[PDB]
Each structure stands twice: as C-alpha cells, then as structure tokens.
Amino acid sequence: IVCHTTATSPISAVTCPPGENLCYRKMWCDAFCSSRGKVVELGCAATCPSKKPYEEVTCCSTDKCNPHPKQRPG
Numbered sequence: 001i002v003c004h005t006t007a008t009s010p011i012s013a014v015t016c017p018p019g020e021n022l023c024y025r026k027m028w029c030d031a032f033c034s035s036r037g038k039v040v041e042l043g044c045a046a047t048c049p050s051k052k053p054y055e056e057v058t059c060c061s062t063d064k065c066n067p068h069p070k071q072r073p074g
Contacts, residue, residue: 016044042066
C-alpha cells in the first residue's frame with residue numbers, strides 16, 4: 001500500500017509487493033529513448049533496494065511516485 005501507478009505493466013494502484021508502504025520506481029525510457037515512454041518497471045520488489053542508475057530509477061514511499069504518461073486507454 002503505497003505507489004498507485006505502474007508496477008509490472010499499467011497496474012492499477014496495486015502498490016507493488018508488501019514492504020508496508022514504498023514503491024521501487026525504475027525504468028521509463030526502455031533503452032532506446034526513441035520517444036514515447038510507457039515501458040517502466042516501478043513495481044517495487046520488497047523495500048526498493050535502489051537497484052542501479054541505468055535508464056531511469058528512483059525510490060518514493062509517500063502514497064506513490066511511479067506514474068507514467070501516455071499509457072493506453074485500453
């Protein structure tokens with residue numbers, strides 16, 4: 001119960017696994033930065049282990065912080 005966005009696809013608030021708040025956010029620019037950007041990770045996977053820098057990454061835990069524009073209305 002935390003991030004209310006992405007997290008293993010379009011999700012729906014899910015808020016990743018347990019950890020009891022928080023949402024590891026990673027990905028955004030796939031790896032081609034060829035425009036767009038709807039292939040993120042921001043999934044959580046415990047307690048946001050931070051992971052690595054690479055493409056895009058972060059770590060929130062304040063209700064959410066792993067959104068994603070564009071998306072698909074279906």
